[PDB]
Design a protein around this ligand. Sequence first.
Ligand code: UTK
Ligand code: UTK
Ligand code: PLP
Ligand code: PLP
Lengths: 364, 365
Amino acid sequence: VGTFKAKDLIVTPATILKEKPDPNNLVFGTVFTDHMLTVEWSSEFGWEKPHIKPLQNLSLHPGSSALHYAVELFEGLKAFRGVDNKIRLFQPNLNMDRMYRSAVRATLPVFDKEELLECIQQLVKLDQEWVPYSTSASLYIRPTFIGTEPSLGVKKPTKALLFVLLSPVGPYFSSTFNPVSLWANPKYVRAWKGGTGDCKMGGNYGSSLFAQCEAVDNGCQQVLWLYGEDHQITEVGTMNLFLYWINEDGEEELATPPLDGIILPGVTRRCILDLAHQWGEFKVSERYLTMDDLTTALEGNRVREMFGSGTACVVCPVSDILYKGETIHIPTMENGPKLASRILSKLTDIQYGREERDWTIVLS
Amino acid sequence: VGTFKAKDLIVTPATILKEKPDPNNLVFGTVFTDHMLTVEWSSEFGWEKPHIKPLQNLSLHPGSSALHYAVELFEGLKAFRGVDNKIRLFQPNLNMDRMYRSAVRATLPVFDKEELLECIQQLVKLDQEWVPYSTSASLYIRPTFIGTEPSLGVKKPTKALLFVLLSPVGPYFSSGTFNPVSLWANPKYVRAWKGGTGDCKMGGNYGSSLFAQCEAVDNGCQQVLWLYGEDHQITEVGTMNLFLYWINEDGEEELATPPLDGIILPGVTRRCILDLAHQWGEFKVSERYLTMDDLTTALEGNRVREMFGSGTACVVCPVSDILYKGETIHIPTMENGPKLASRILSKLTDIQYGREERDWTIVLS
Ligand SMILES: Cc1ccccc1Oc1cc(-n2c(=O)cc(C(F)(F)F)[nH]c2=O)c(F)cc1C#N
Ligand SMILES: Cc1ccccc1Oc1cc(-n2c(=O)cc(C(F)(F)F)[nH]c2=O)c(F)cc1C#N
Ligand SMILES: *Cc1c(COP(=O)(O)O)cnc(C)c1O
Ligand SMILES: *Cc1c(COP(=O)(O)O)cnc(C)c1O
């Protein structure tokens, strides 16, 4: 159980550089930078020295376990060009923690978290002009970890590739807030107790595409993932779910589903709970929320705001849920949205260096 | 929509051929033949013409959805060199049915099932000397279907590759005789859930299983017994369907297997075994729920005869033991012959190797 070291980085700069895209006409994860990180592993020799080199196709054996048994995991984090023109990562330690834990659950080989971070930092530094010159755009960092075992045997891989892509992304909505409609159909399940839903393992995402297409066919933008006999609301697509409301006890509450195995422990989710705890202005509950809790609250005018949280869209307001053939209105946009707007501004201010924070590291 | 057609096959023969492996010293899925099938798809142009060409690395964009969101599915079926030296596929139509259905559930593009079969048949024909000269070995056919979308967007792919590998494989167990397995039963891990993809051969179902398989091996077990629900239903033996041969609660001789309620992969071998047992008409055949309590209650009453896994891998794999809640539970399969397991093995083996005629076999094109 060794590791690749950032000290050993072999840098092959590209001799031909690509034009950067317009920040205001960007489709998410469509455009890639000049360079990538790649690190080879084998059971026989362990970690090879890491490479920063030009973006290129991967040459994979067609038996590679990533292609057959989804022996794969990824991360998502961003680099932000601040108002002071300094580039910052946001809580990147939490991403490295989550990637390591996911690697263990996948049986992919462990690595030193600080060494991968330093390798990512060198990659973003070389491609730093790709971090858009825009206070509403970012560079998406996609660490990826794949089994490359050339064997059809269902086993712990004896060959893996860890690589990192960079992709400049614009504002989540090309437009201020575009509130989403959620397609809520309990027939589909994202994740289950005893499953891998609390990891960013590829297997969790492939099974979701069918339901996402069903959502789009019914003029919704995301899936509301329901779970269990009592229809728990768990996640908004690939975003954590927050409910701002008067609870059953008549108390002002920010509620989110708890980490009981079926929720991806989001970085944004952690940051929002940390903020709401620190503010000390209302109750903060990691607790179960059902469609009946929600509809009961809406008939009693107890619901203020619902929003998704994630690296993608820091705070994504929900306006409507389609469920049992009815459109259910969530009055998020008629209540400001006051708290969603405040949370967006606090995280945005930290990300873009408008305010100092422990949560940000300036680029190496 | 539309489909690639076998009539459009572009064949690029290999100019250098590899030596075949020893039929008696084969490891599953480690050795590959001279050629592969590849077919490109895009939303813009649809299916390109299929290629049979030398085995080669795939050139994939590192954003390919197969690498990120497991936008992928596979099949497993075998070609058998029979006692009459004729090469036979076994129920290959059922594999094409299952691949199509899996493609729909994955949001990968549909294709004509007959055209893929004919493409596979041409591939196996060109590489037919790879079908081992051994009546206890096979050629494993691995159809694979991957999203190759160069975009990190979590979406229906606008780019896919369908390809087929061939791998000569020996008997499941080296000895050729039954090597009975121990199952590691830990309810903490769940293979599949209602509203999930457990009834498809989608890659996502398999990645989550490796950790549990390693836990099994660490406790001297060979396979995972997949438990489900508050009452601990026995569902599957690793990547094999589960059969229980026993006296049921009604005092009747019964072959039981869990039913296709969404959390069971509809196995070809599973279908063949039910078809046989129905046809024989010698005992009750029940697609029904089986719990660890049903099993342990039956063992206390000496009501259990045989437990076996079923699958293309190991036609019939006897179970001798289950580790569950820190106790070793003995299944007396090997002390009861195993009579039914042995009969089922013989019938399917005889069909596969052309010892007996059947509708279930197609001779090679
Ligand atoms: C790429 C990714 C995978 C898994 C979890 C999170 C994640 O991050 C993002 C996801 C998305 N994204 C999609 O790719 C598709 C959808 C649709 F709704 F269409 F399914 N929604 C989305 O938010 C995005 F647009 C941006 C980011 C970012 N940053
Ligand atoms: C490769 C494959 C994938 C999914 C479903 C079935 C399937 O078929 C097989 C599986 C296995 N196989 C493994 O790959 C590992 C394991 C252990 F659990 F031990 F890791 N057991 C096994 O039976 C095998 F040995 C042969 C065949 C065949 N043909
Ligand atoms: C990535 C992800 C999230 C959000 O996590 P962040 O670290 O906040 O980006 C939420 N749910 C699922 C299922 C995810 O995959
Ligand atoms: C493939 C598979 C089976 C058995 O399939 P056969 O067609 O009989 O080889 C059983 N369970 C799982 C999970 C499988 O993937």
